[PDB]
């Protein structure tokens, strides 16, 4: 049986993550919310909520600190630090309109954030100097970005080309590898924590 359940939102739950303390966060089109699922009384009510910043799509939590980035639908990601930030800082490509679908903190190299967007594009972000970094347009839309947990520079995009592209974040000229085996579109990709499987 489940440990803790709650009727969180109205619409579907698009993104969801765990904090580094014990608490969990969830996106929707409603706006993101924070719960304490491990408490000596069970509480259904959230302990923080956030609606300003457009329709959010995904979450990604930092490896060490209490920072997390939410990918919104206004073409920006916005970065909160828990316990001393309220609205967060909205980082965006300067003239960007299409929605950012997924967001993923690099767990090895902290303060490097990857994102995909429905411009069939991947975009990077440096959190240390808060600006985007590089943007490449691929041929088909990418559903999900992910990073390698043992090699800090390699990423994988699961894309509507039925395909997985393993890229190098330093040289976006060519794909390091192209996994092609599917029939319909690829919805989710995840590296193994040993970094050698997918």
């Amino acid at each position: 049986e489940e440990t803790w359940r709650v009727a969180a939102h109205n619409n579907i739950v698009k993104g969801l993550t765990f904090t580094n303390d014990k608490k969990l966060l969830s996106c929707a089109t409603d706006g993101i919310k924070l719960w304490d699922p491990y408490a000596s009384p069970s509480n259904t009510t959230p302990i923080a909520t956030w609606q300003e910043g457009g329709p959010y799509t995904s979450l990604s939590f930092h490896r060490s600190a209490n920072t997390f980035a939410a990918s919104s639908g206004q073409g920006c990601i916005r970065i909160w630090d828990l316990e001393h930030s309220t609205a967060g800082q909205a980082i965006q490509w300067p003239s960007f309109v299409d929605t950012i679908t997924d967001v993923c903190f690099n767990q090895v190299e902290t303060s490097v954030i990857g994102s995909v967007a429905t411009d069939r594009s991947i975009i990077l972000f440096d959190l240390r100097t808060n600006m985007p970094v590089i943007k490449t347009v691929l041929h088909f839309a990418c559903n999900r970005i992910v990073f390698n947990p043992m090699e800090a520079m390699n990423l994988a995009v699961a894309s509507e080309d039925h395909n997985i592209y393993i890229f190098d974040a330093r040289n976006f000229d060519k794909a390091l590898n192209i996994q092609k085996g599917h029939v319909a579109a690829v919805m989710d990709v995840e590296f193994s924590p040993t970094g050698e499987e997918l």
């Binding site: 069939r120 088909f140 839309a141 559903n143 509507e160 039925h162 319909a184 579109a185």
Partner: protein, 81 residues
């Protein structure tokens, strides 16, 4: 297939689609400028002309009509806009 960006097809797949089946339909015909070397006259011809286009006088020709593009005649120049 299953998911694709339908508001942003590729230009190469858009370009091989028939006329009326591009995302917003549009022509694929063009206009040309034509001079004939003895004359400093600049007649502007449509690519798929049905008229035996004649320059400003001089009972010549400039093109003949076909089933598709107008066949420009002989030695003639053409910039295309």
């Amino acid at each position: 297939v299953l998911a694709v960006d339908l508001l942003n097809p590729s230009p190469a797949s858009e370009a091989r689609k028939h006329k009326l089946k591009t995302l917003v339909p549009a022509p694929r015909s063009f206009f040309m400028d034509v001079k004939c070397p003895g004359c400093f006259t600049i007649t502007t011809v449509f690519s798929h002309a049905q008229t035996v286009v004649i320059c400003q006088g001089c009972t010549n020709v400039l093109c003949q009509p076909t089933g598709g593009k107008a066949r420009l005649t002989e030695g003639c120049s053409f910039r295309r806009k």
